[PDB]
C-alpha cells in the first residue's frame, strides 16, 4: 500500500504534545492547559521572495504533521526584518499553502509580538543576561577569534547601565550599526552560535505593519524561540541548517523562565541541478532569460504550478522520499517521473497535432460523416470520465512526421506509399496517394480503405479540420540548464543556459472537445486509495490532459478563449 511519512522515521518518533523537555517542568501546566493534547506547529517563511520547491517539504512536514494528528498549524509570516515588504510575497505564500490543500489554523505575524518581545528584552537585561555594545563589525571578529575569544568592556556594564542605554536605543538615540544589544551567554563555549549573539539591532526605519513605532528591531536569534513559546509550539520543525542554533534556542528560553519548545531538525530537500541563489535567479528574470518568477522552467512554487504540476504529485513525491535527519540529493528526473506517473492516472486523453498537415481523403464525399465515439480514459475506468464524439470526414489534419512521400524503412510504421496507417478509433486505414503543393503548405491526398480488413502497423491521431481548435502558442519546456551543476560552469551559470529550454510552436491544432475539458475543469480525478487527492480551484493550470502521442499539457496563465496557450507539463516517455 501507501506508507504515510508521518508514522515513520523522523516524524513518527517525535515526542507527544505536552511532553517537551523542560528545564523548569512546572512551565508545562500553563502549556498543557492551552494545547489539550493537540499538536501545534508553525510555518515561518520570510516574506522577501517566492517559495521554491524546498518549501513544499517545509509546508508538508509542518501542516501535515499537525493534520495527521488532528492538531493545528500556524501560518506565521517572519516579518522581523522591516523592508519594502511587497504584498505579493504575502499573497503568494498564502496561495501556495492553500494550493497544497492545507488550511492554517491561524495566520500570524512575527511583528504581532514586538511589544511582548520588548518586555522580555528588559527581563533579560534586568537578569544581567544581556548588554549593549558599541563595537564595529570588525571589532567583534577579533573578540570571536579571527583565535582567542576576549570579552568586551560593555559586557561588564552594570544592569542599570544596560537599562539606561537600551531605553535610549528604543527612542532612536543611536544610528544604524553603532549600538547593539548582545546576549550575555558564554565565551568559553566552543559553539560559535553562543559568542554573545546580537538580540536587538537599531534600524530607525518604518515597518510595514507597525510603522515608526519601533526604532529598534530584534534579530532572528531572539525572535524564533520566543515566538514559538508564545504560540505554544509543541513541535518546532526546521531544517538541519540550524542544528547548532538549538543551543542558543534552548538557552534563551531557559534564561527567561518561559516554556521551552522542542526544536527537532530534519534534512532539507536538495534537487540536483538547481541554483538557489535568489540574486542569481533575480538576474535571470531581469535580463529576460525567463519570463517571470513563475516561469514554468523554474523550481519555484508559482512556476511549478504554472508548469501544470498538480499539487498532489508534489506531496506524493515528498512522502515517498520520507523525512530523516539526512539531507537528500534527488535527481530532477525522479521528480518528473513522479509527476508523469501522477498525470497518467488523473488526466483525460485528447488528440492534438503539433505539426499539422492537411489531409484530403479523395474517395470520400463532402457530405460524408462518420461519428466516432471515443472514451476520455480508455482502460478500467472508461465510463467514469465519459465519452466524446469526433466527426470523421473528407478533411482532417495529421502530423507532418506521420506521413512521408518516400517508401518506409524498418523504423517507420506510419503513413507512406505502399504502407497504410490507421486512424485512432476509425474502422479502416488510409492509404497514400500523392502530395499536393498548395499555398506554401503541403496537402496529402489519401484513400479511405473502406471494407478491407488489414491490420496497420500503428494508429496515429487526427483532428477534424472544420471544427479544429487553432492554438496560438504551445510552449515545449525542458531543463533550464544543460548541466547538473551550472554554477560550476567554467564561464558562469549564464553560459550554461539551455537554448532549447523553451520551444514555441505556432501552428498546432487540437480537437474541438478541449472546450469540454475546460468546462469540466477543475476536474480533480482521484487516485483510488491515495491520501494525496488534492482538490484545486479554477484556473488555466487545472485544464490538464494527455496528448495521445506527444505528452501531457495544460492551459497557461496567458491563455484566453480566442488565444489558447499550452504548456507541455512533462514528456510522454
Ligand X SMILES: O=C(/C=C/c1cccs1)Nc1ncccn1
Residue numbers in the known binding site for Zn(2+) are 133, 135, 154
- Closer to Zn ion by Cβ: residue 133 or 474: 133
Neighbours of 161 (CB within 10 A): 14
Return the one option of Zn ion, ligand X, none that residue 274 interacts with (CB less than 5 to 8 A, by type). Answer: ligand X
Strand partners, 238: 265
Our finding on whether 154 is near Zn ion (CB under 5 A) is yes
Contacts 24+ apart (CB under 8 A), 558-562: none
Sorted by sequence, the CB contacts under 8 Å of residue 546 that are 6+ apart come out as: 343, 344, 347, 348, 349, 350, 552, 553, 572
Closest contact distance (angstroms) between CB of 43 and Zn ion is 36
Contacts 24+ apart (CB under 8 A), 14-18: 14/65, 14/235, 14/262, 14/264, 15/235, 15/262, 17/69, 17/71, 17/234, 17/235, 18/234
Return the one option of ligand X, Zn ion, none that residue 480 interacts with (CB less than 5 to 8 A, by type). Answer: ligand X
First to last CA, the chain: 25
Our finding on whether 183 is near Zn ion (CB under 5 A) is no
Our finding on whether 298 is near ligand X (CB under 6 A) is yes
Cis preceding-peptide flag for 345 (omega within 30 of 0): no
Give the total of residues touching Zn ion (CB under 5 A). Answer: 4
Give the total of residues touching ligand X (CB under 6 A). Answer: 13
Instruction: Choose one: 64-72, 231-239, 292-300, 400-408; the region binding ligand X (CB under 6 A).
Output: 292-300
Our finding on whether 75 is near Zn ion (CB under 5 A) is no
Residue 80 per-residue DSSP state:
T
Return the one option of Zn ion, ligand X, none that residue 52 interacts with (CB less than 5 to 8 A, by type). Answer: ligand X
131 alpha-carbon distance from chain centroid? 42
Is 278 a residue of the active site?
Answer: yes
Our finding on whether 274 is near ligand X (CB under 6 A) is yes
Tell which one of 23, 88, 151, 276 touches ligand X (CB under 6 A): 276
Our finding on whether 275 is near ligand X (CB under 6 A) is yes
d(CA 524, CA 384): 12
d(CA 501, CA 482): 9
Our finding on whether 284 is near ligand X (CB under 6 A) is no
Instruction: Choose one: 125-133, 195-203, 456-464, 538-546; the region binding Zn ion (CB under 5 A).
Output: 125-133
Torsion angle of the four alpha carbons 403, 405, 410, 415, in this order, in degrees rounded to the nearest 10: 30
Our finding on whether 135 is near Zn ion (CB under 5 A) is yes
Binding residues, by number, are 133, 135, 154
Instruction: Choose one: 9-17, 151-159, 265-273, 276-284; the region binding Zn ion (CB under 5 A).
Output: 151-159
Return the one option of ligand X, Zn ion, none that residue 80 interacts with (CB less than 5 to 8 A, by type). Answer: none
Closest contact distance (angstroms) between CB of 65 and Zn ion is 42
Query: Burial level of 214, CB count in 10 A (0-12/13-18/19+)?
Result: buried
- H-helix or E-strand spanning residue 146: none
Q: Which three cell numbers stand for residue 172?
A: 532612536
Our finding on whether 106 is near ligand X (CB under 6 A) is no
Per-residue x/- track, 34-73, ligand X (CB under 6 A) = ---------------xx-x---------------------
Return the one option of Zn ion, ligand X, none that residue 154 interacts with (CB less than 5 to 8 A, by type). Answer: Zn ion
Nearest partner of 388 among 350, 346, 426, judged by Cα: 350
Our finding on whether 304 is near ligand X (CB under 6 A) is no
Is 268 a residue of the active site?
Answer: yes
Closest contact distance (angstroms) between CB of 442 and ligand X is 38
Set 126, 153, 278, 441: catalytic member:
278
d(CA 19, CA 41): 14
Nearest partner of 391 among 336, 329, 460, 465, judged by Cα: 465
Check: CB of residue 297 under 8 Å from CB of residue 303: yes
Tell which one of 35, 39, 152, 238 touches Zn ion (CB under 5 A): 152
Closest contact distance (angstroms) between CB of 269 and ligand X is 13
Closest contact distance (angstroms) between CB of 10 and ligand X is 25
Tell which one of 35, 181, 269, 281 touches ligand X (CB under 6 A): 281
Tell which one of 66, 73, 133, 547 touches Zn ion (CB under 5 A): 133
Return the one option of Zn ion, ligand X, none that residue 135 interacts with (CB less than 5 to 8 A, by type). Answer: Zn ion
Check: CB of residue 315 under 8 Å from CB of residue 100: yes
Angle between helices 54-68 and 87-99 (to 10 degrees): 60
- H-helix or E-strand spanning residue 239: strand 235-239
Closest contact distance (angstroms) between CB of 156 and Zn ion is 10
Check: CB of residue 332 under 8 Å from CB of residue 273: yes
Check: CB of residue 332 under 8 Å from CB of residue 271: yes
Per-residue x/- track, 472-491, ligand X (CB under 6 A) = --------xx----------
Return the one option of ligand X, Zn ion, none that residue 323 interacts with (CB less than 5 to 8 A, by type). Answer: none
Our finding on whether 290 is near ligand X (CB under 6 A) is no
Is 155 a residue of the active site?
Answer: no
Return the one option of ligand X, Zn ion, none that residue 152 interacts with (CB less than 5 to 8 A, by type). Answer: Zn ion
- Closer to ligand X by Cβ: residue 70 or 279: 279
Sorted by sequence, the CB contacts under 8 Å of residue 562 that are 6+ apart come out as: none
Query: Burial level of 351, CB count in 10 A (0-12/13-18/19+)?
Result: buried
Catalytic residue set: 46, 268, 278
Binding site for ligand X (CB under 6 A): 49-50, 52, 274-276, 278, 281, 298-300, 480-481
Binding site for Zn ion (CB under 5 A): 133, 135, 152, 154
Amino acid at each position: 500500500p501507501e506508507r504515510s511519512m508521518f508514522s515513520e522515521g523522523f516524524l513518527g518518533d517525535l515526542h507527544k504534545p505536552g511532553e517537551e523537555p523542560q528545564m523548569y517542568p512546572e512551565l508545562l501546566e500553563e502549556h498543557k492547559k492551552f494545547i489539550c493534547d493537540k499538536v501545534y506547529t508553525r510555518f515561518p517563511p520570510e516574506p522577501n521572495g517566492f517559495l521554491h520547491i524546498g518549501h513544499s517539504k517545509a509546508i508538508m512536514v509542518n501542516f501535515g504533521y499537525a493534520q495527521f494528528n488532528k492538531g493545528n498549524c500556524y501560518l506565521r509570516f517572519d516579518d522581523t526584518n522591516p523592508e519594502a515588504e511587497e504584498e505579493v510575497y504575502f499573497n503568494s505564500i498564502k496561495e501556495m499553502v492553500s494550493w497544497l490543500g492545507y488550511k492554517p489554523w491561524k495566520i500570524t505575524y512575527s511583528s504581532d509580538y514586538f511589544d511582548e518581545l520588548y518586555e522580555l528584552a528588559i527581563k533579560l537585561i534586568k537578569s544581567d543576561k544581556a548588554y549593549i555594545c558599541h563595537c564595529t563589525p570588525e571589532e567583534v571578529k577579533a573578540s570571536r577569534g579571527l583565535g582567542e575569544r576576549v570579552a568586551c568592556k560593555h559586557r561588564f556594564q552594570t544592569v542599570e547601565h544596560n537599562l539606561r542605554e537600551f531605553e535610549n536605543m528604543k527612542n532612536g538615540k543611536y544610528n544604524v550599526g553603532e549600538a547593539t544589544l548582545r546576549m550575555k551567554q558564554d565565551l568559553n563555549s566552543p559553539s560559535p552560535q553562543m559568542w554573545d549573539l546580537v538580540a536587538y539591532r537599531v534600524l530607525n526605519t518604518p515597518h510595514h505593519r507597525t510603522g515608526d513605532k519601533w526604532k529598534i528591531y530584534p534579530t532572528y536569534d531572539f525572535t524564533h524561540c520566543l515566538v514559538d513559546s508564545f504560540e505554544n509550539i509543541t513541535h518546532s520543525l526546521c531544517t538541519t541548517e540550524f542544528v547548532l542554533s538549538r543551543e542558543s534556542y534552548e538557552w534563551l528560553c531557559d534564561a527567561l523562565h518561559v516554556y521551552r519548545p522542542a526544536q527537532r531538525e530534519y534534512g532539507r530537500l536538495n534537487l540536483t541541478g538547481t541554483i538557489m541563489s535568489k540574486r542569481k535567479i533575480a538576474k535571470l528574470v531581469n535580463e529576460g532569460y525567463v519570463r517571470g518568477w513563475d516561469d514554468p522552467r523554474l523550481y519555484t512554487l508559482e512556476g511549478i504550478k504554472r508548469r501544470g504540476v498538480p499539487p498532489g504529485a508534489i506531496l506524493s513525491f515528498i512522502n515517498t522520499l520520507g523525512v530523516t535527519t539526512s539531507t537528500t540529493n534527488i535527481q530532477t528526473v525522479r521528480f518528473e517521473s513522479a509527476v508523469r506517473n501522477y498525470l497518467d492516472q488523473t488526466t483525460p486523453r485528447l488528440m492534438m497535432v503539433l505539426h499539422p498537415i492537411e489531409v484530403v481523403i479523395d474517395n470520400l464525399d463532402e457530405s460524408f460523416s462518420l461519428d466516432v465515439e471515443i472514451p476520455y480514459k480508455p482502460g478500467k475506468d472508461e465510463k467514469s470520465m465519459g465519452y466524446r464524439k469526433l466527426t470523421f470526414s473528407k478533411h482532417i489534419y495529421i502530423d507532418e512526421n506521420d506521413v512521408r512521400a518516400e517508401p518506409a524503412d524498418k523504423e517507420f510504421y506510419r503513413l507512406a506509399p505502399g504502407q497504410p496507417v490507421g486512424l485512432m478509433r476509425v474502422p479502416f486505414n488510409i492509404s497514400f496517394k500523392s502530395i499536393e503543393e498548395k499555398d506554401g503548405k503541403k496537402i496529402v491526398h489519401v484513400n479511405y480503405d473502406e471494407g478491407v480488413k488489414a491490420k496497420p502497423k500503428t494508429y496515429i491521431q487526427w483532428i477534424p479540420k472544420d471544427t479544429a481548435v487553432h492554438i496560438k502558442e504551445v510552449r515545449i519546456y525542458n531543463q533550464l540548464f544543460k548541466s547538473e551543476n551550472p554554477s560550476a560552469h567554467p564561464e558562469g551559470y549564464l553560459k550554461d543556459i539551455n537554448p532549447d529550454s523553451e520551444e514555441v510552436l505556432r501552428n498546432a491544432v487540437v480537437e474541438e472537445n478541449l472546450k469540454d475539458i475546460v468546462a469540466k475543469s477543475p476536474m480533480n480525478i482521484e487516485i483510488p486509495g491515495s491520501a494525496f487527492n488534492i482538490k484545486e480551484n479554477k484556473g488555466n493550470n487545472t485544464v490538464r490532459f494527455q496528448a495521445l502521442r506527444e505528452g501531457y499539457f495544460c492551459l497557461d496563465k496567458d491563455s484566453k478563449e480566442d488565444g489558447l496557450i499550452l504548456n507541455r507539463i512533462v514528456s510522454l516517455k
